[PDB]
Amino acid sequence: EGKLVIWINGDKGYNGLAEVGKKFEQDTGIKVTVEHPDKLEEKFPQVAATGDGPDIIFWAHDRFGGYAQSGLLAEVTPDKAFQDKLYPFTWDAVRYNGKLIAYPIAVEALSLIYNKDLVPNPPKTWEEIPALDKELKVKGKSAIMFNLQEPYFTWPLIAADGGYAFKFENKYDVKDVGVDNAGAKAGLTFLIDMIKNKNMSADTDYSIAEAAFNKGETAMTINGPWAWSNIDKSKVNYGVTLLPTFKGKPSKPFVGVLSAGINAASPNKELAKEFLENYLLTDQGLEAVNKDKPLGAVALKSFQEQLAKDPRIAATMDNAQKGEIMPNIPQMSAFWYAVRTAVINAASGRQTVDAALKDAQSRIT
Numbered sequence: 001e002g003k004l005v006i007w008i009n010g011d012k013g014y015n016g017l018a019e020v021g022k023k024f025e026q027d028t029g030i031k032v033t034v035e036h037p038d039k040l041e042e043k044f045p046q047v048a049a050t051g052d053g054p055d056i057i058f059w060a061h062d063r064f065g066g067y068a069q070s071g072l073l074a075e076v077t078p079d080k081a082f083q084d085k086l087y088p089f090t091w092d093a094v095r096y097n098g099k100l101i102a103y104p105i106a107v108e109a110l111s112l113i114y115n116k117d118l119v120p121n122p123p124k125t126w127e128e129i130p131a132l133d134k135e136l137k138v139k140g141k142s143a144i145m146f147n148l149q150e151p152y153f154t155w156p157l158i159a160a161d162g163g164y165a166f167k168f169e170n171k172y173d174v175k176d177v178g179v180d181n182a183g184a185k186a187g188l189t190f191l192i193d194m195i196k197n198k199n200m201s202a203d204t205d206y207s208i209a210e211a212a213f214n215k216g217e218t219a220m221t222i223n224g225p226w227a228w229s230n231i232d233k234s235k236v237n238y239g240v241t242l243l244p245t246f247k248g249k250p251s252k253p254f255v256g257v258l259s260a261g262i263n264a265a266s267p268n269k270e271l272a273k274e275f276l277e278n279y280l281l282t283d284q285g286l287e288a289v290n291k292d293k294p295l296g297a298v299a300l301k302s303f304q305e306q307l308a309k310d311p312r313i314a315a316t317m318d319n320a321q322k323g324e325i326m327p328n329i330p331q332m333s334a335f336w337y338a339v340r341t342a343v344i345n346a347a348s349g350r351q352t353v354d355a356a357l358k359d360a361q362s363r364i365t
């Protein structure tokens, strides 16, 4: 009691957040400690269920329905004046069983990131990437590398031709799942065909793809706003644009709302509210995080007005509008674990595309 412990993922601007924490302490005398444990989103329910854990947890909103269902989050209590400072759809992302159970911070979607000096006119279709790769391979380069280990990054292609997670009835139907329909299989088959053709490698992960793109070894990558800061520091002149289409249809990234939840076991709920409402969710607080690692579009209208001019943010929102907001229901983690296994198994040859996605469908439903 008398201090704040915050958990945030290691790809986010945790040093910038710590600067907001230092300002909070200067003003209040209350110490703010920012940590970025690994697997924090799996650890939180295990420690919060014993009355331990951080005061504030940051993640995309998809995890938070499961937390709320288990009673691990405090209902947040912003007055109507504060609610009107943030975009309504961001509050919708953090509403569960009619209650607000987090503060929305930022809106994330994946984009195509391209080296302007290797591909001045980036490909508009996935289908043209193999021919581009062939020309780059004679120069000792590759067309594209992105994280193939996490389903977040492959989902936009799987969804393009008709894949979906849970069907929404204007409630989600947790038994109407679109992981093994024909559209999902078509997109995952194309990924596997690129791997078979040696346009990509099944073992590429986040670090490998980031290093290759930021050293000028691959012409394109797929990543979110948090990655831009490291590219700024690199030698690469990059642009951010629409994901390629597949079978003429847009890639459909899942849209995540970075959210801050208050632990139901926290003895510091009033302090957490003060920190989040009056320090973090200000133009200056978000600026401090954003200059560390970019947040994307932000939930705070006044600061989003200042970011909306950036072509990178425009591209982020263009991809977001072609995609879908993630569900926040508890079943979302089952979806992600099952799809992760399916993609890895298909890409490594441990299962056919059809067998992998059928097994995932069975697991989720």
Ligand SMILES: OC[C@H]1O[C@H](O[C@H]2[C@H](O)[C@@H](O)[C@@H](O)O[C@@H]2CO)[C@H](O)[C@@H](O)[C@@H]1O
Pocket (backbone or CB within 6 Å): 009, 011, 060, 061, 062, 063, 108, 150, 151, 152, 153, 224, 256, 336
């Ligand atoms: O891959 C499954 C994973 O997807 C999402 O995680 C994203 C996250 O939203 C981004 O902010 C960034 O950290 O990349 C992650 C993928 O590595 C879901 O939010 C998450 O629950 C899910 O595990």
Ligand SMILES: OC[C@H]1OC[C@H](O)[C@@H](O)[C@@H]1O
Pocket (backbone or CB within 6 Å): 039, 042, 340
């Ligand atoms: O178990 C698969 C994945 O699920 C949760 C962890 O965040 C990631 O470290 C783990 O790989």
Ligand SMILES: OC[C@H]1OC[C@H](O)[C@@H](O)[C@@H]1O
Pocket (backbone or CB within 6 Å): 149
């Ligand atoms: O369950 C262990 C999992 O956790 C972290 C890794 O990202 C994943 O490769 C591994 O399979």
Ligand SMILES: OC[C@H]1OC[C@H](O)[C@@H](O)[C@@H]1O
Pocket (backbone or CB within 6 Å): 041, 042, 063, 150, 151, 333, 336, 337, 340
């Ligand atoms: O891809 C596996 C990942 O999918 C979603 C989960 O939130 C995270 O724990 C899980 O790691």
Ligand SMILES: [Mg+2]
Pocket (backbone or CB within 6 Å): 009, 038, 039, 040, 041
């Ligand atoms: Mg983690």
Ligand SMILES: [Mg+2]
Pocket (backbone or CB within 6 Å): 068, 071, 073, 074, 075, 099, 101
């Ligand atoms: Mg609650």
Ligand SMILES: [Mg+2]
Pocket (backbone or CB within 6 Å): 149
């Ligand atoms: Mg792996």
